[PDB]
Amino acid sequence: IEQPRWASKDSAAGAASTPDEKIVLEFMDALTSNDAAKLIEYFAEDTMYQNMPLPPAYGRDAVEQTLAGFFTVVSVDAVETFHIGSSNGLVYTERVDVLRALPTGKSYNFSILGVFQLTEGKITGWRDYFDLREFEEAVDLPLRG
Amino acid sequence: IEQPRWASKDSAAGAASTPDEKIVLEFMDALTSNDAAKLIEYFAEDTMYQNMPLPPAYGRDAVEQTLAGFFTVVSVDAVETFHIGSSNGLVYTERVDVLRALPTGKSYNFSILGVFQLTEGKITGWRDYFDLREFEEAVDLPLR
């Protein structure tokens, strides 16, 4: 993965300068664990996770069930974060996620802009925006959308 | 268009508090014009516009021709911005755009998170991240 031409080092991952920004970057790194039990500990009880516009998961239990199910069929092979920033209680990651489908071996680069809302350092909302055209094929599950 | 359960008034569009954030909202309200020539006045000469991951447009001419083409087959009927924010010289909009295809009259709700880079009050970069599964059918053009 090459740094796009629009990347700005003023907003680079290395330049994260708030506790919320730094926790999110740590959480980006943990995604390659493909461990739902490890990822869930970043989340408040009152939380939500959604890849738009698929049905949202609300509450810790639903978020963990969703992640564990995703890790059953896909491996997050790499997370490259070009931009991270924050504003008005929200954190934004502009990034690429490399996903590999386990039954097929095929790999997929997804360009993702994600928003995170943290409360006392725990994730209260997580929403990723990206194209789903190849997400259906990448993910051997009905996505209900 | 309903306000989502996750909407935070702390970052609502009515609370925009920088010049760059205020311009980006104005550009949001101007989208319903469907007028590439009124919209291009917002862009600097070195600029780019991309609906991720489609082939980007670099340079103000290419951005103009991309919008002009889009507005030939699609109307932007509404833009609701739930959140506007900014950080490290980038502005972010979490919003919904209602798009209507001209040849069919079918409408579509696109949930969109966009990032804007502005230099001297002019757009040097604009990337919208959203699901393009229905965008193929929405715009009567090859997506490449």
Interface contact A111-B53, CB threshold 8 A: yes
CB B90 within 8 A of CB B115: yes
CB B88 within 8 A of CB A15: yes
List, as one string, the DSSP characters of B77-95. Answer: EEEEEEEEEEETTEEEEEE
> Can you give the residue range of the structural domain that contains A126?
1-145
B130 CB neighbours in chain A (<8 A) are 52, 129-131
Q: CB-based burial of residue B93 (10 Å sphere; 0-12 exposed, 13-18 middle, 19+ buried)?
A: buried
Chain B nearest CA to A28, separation (Å): 18
Tokens of B109: 């709700």
Interface contact B53-A10, CB threshold 8 A: no
Of B113, B108, B116, B114, nearest to B133 by C-alpha is B108
Query: How many Å apart are CA B4 and CA A34, to the nearest integer?
Result: 29
Q: What is the CATH number of the domain that holds A124?
A: 3.10.450.50
Of B140, B142, B124, nearest to B63 by C-alpha is B124
Tokens of B86: 């900014």
Looking up tokens 């909202």 gives B25
Closest-CA residue in chain B for A54? B131
- Cβ of B103 under 8 Å from any chain A Cβ? no
Q: Which helix (H) or strand (E) element contains residue B101? A: strand B90-101
A7 CB neighbours in chain B (<8 A) are none
In A2-134, DSSP assigns E strands to 48-51, 57-58, 74-87, 90-101, 107-119, 122-129
Q: List all residues 6 or more positions away from A96 whose beta carbon is below 8 Å from its beta carbon.
A: A1, A78, A79, A80, A82, A109, A110, A111, A112
- Cβ of A20 under 8 Å from any chain B Cβ? no
Chain A nearest CA to B108, separation (Å): 12
Mutate to test the interface with B, among A52, A80, A83, A117 (most CBs of B within 10 A): A52
Closest-CA residue in chain A for B134? A133
Alpha-carbon dihedral sign for residues B3, B9, B15, B21? negative
Count structural domains, chain A: 1
CB A128 within 8 A of CB A51: yes
Half-sphere exposure of B110 (CA within 13 A, CB side): 30
CB B40 within 8 A of CB B33: no
A–B CB contacts, 8 A cutoff, strictly below: 108
Q: CB-based burial of residue B14 (10 Å sphere; 0-12 exposed, 13-18 middle, 19+ buried)?
A: exposed
Query: How many Å apart are CA B38 and CA B27, to the nearest integer?
Result: 10
- Cβ of A98 under 8 Å from any chain B Cβ? no
Question: B97 catalytic, yes or no?
Answer: yes
Closest-CA residue in chain A for B47? A6
Query: How many Å apart are CA A8 and CA A15, to the nearest integer?
Result: 11
Question: Could you give the C-alpha distances from A35 to A31, A38, A105, B46, in angstroms and in order?
Answer: 8, 5, 19, 43
Q: For residue B125, give the nearest of A6, A111, A125 by CB distance.
A: A6
Interface contact A15-B85, CB threshold 8 A: no
User: Which positions of A are catalytic?
Assistant: 97, 128
CB A138 within 8 A of CB A61: no
Resolution of the experimental model in angstroms, please? 2.3
